[PDB]
Design a binder for this molecule. Structure first.
Ligand SMILES: Cc1cc([C@H](Nc2ccc3c(c2)CNC3)C(=O)NCC(F)F)cc(C(F)(F)F)c1
Lengths: 154, 39
């Protein structure tokens, strides 16, 4: 339960497969709904049970309520702490674009990683998590663009 | 319980970091299944 970034693994497919990534903060594990589909997780000999989740937001928390509440300021570069399958964690700095929706505008990160990188955290210059990478679109020119997906701290 | 977690690092801003990616402005829609589509 040390704070930090974690891989989410399964043995249900061939060998051991990385299906996504998440963030341990304040004793809560944070990831994208489509990574776990709300299943329980193991950490060593211990179990993490889902506590909150929402398919439309594509988010889920384990062991307690969603704790991440920092926001992209709309101006500054950010860092993706990318954790790709079988590869070391690496920081990638970028200026977000924008997703424009009927319900308002969201920052967007235009970086292409494999599906199992979903749930990698996006950071501000204070190292705060401003959202998770891995729900987005493929655009005309073929690139992957991710929303900056952030939950609500209740 | 199939799925398990393994630590991969600390959450820190790195001054060394490689700078890349563009900043597209995109009209999108979000459906009830949490799927984005381009408008
Ligand atoms: C990093 C990454 C993430 C995705 C991601 N997949 C996905 C799958 C199921 C659901 C959702 C997201 C949200 N609701 C259920 C995604 O945005 N998909 C949309 C588009 F990009 F395909 C996909 C990829 C990859 F591009 F590699 F397929 C990568």
């Amino acid at each position: 339960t040390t704070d930090g970034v974690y891989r989410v693994m399964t043995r249900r497919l061939l060998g051991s497969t990385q299906v996504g990534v998440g963030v341990m903060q304040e004793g809560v594990f944070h990831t994208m709904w489509h990574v776990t589909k709300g299943a329980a997780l193991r950490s060593g000999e211990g179990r993490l049970d889902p506590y909150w989740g929402d398919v439309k937001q594509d988010l889920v928390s384990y062991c307690g309520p969603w704790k991440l509440d920092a926001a992209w300021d709309g101006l500054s570069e950010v860092q993706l702490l990318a954790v790709p399958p079988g590869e070391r964690a690496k920081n990638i700095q970028t200026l977000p674009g924008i997703f424009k929706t009927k319900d308002g505008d969201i920052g967007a990160v235009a970086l292409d990683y494999p599906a199992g990188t979903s749930g990698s955290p996006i950071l501000d210059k204070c190292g705060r998590v401003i959202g998770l990478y891995g729900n987005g679109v493929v655009i005309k020119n073929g690139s992957y663009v991710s929303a900056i997906t952030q939950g609500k701290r209740e």
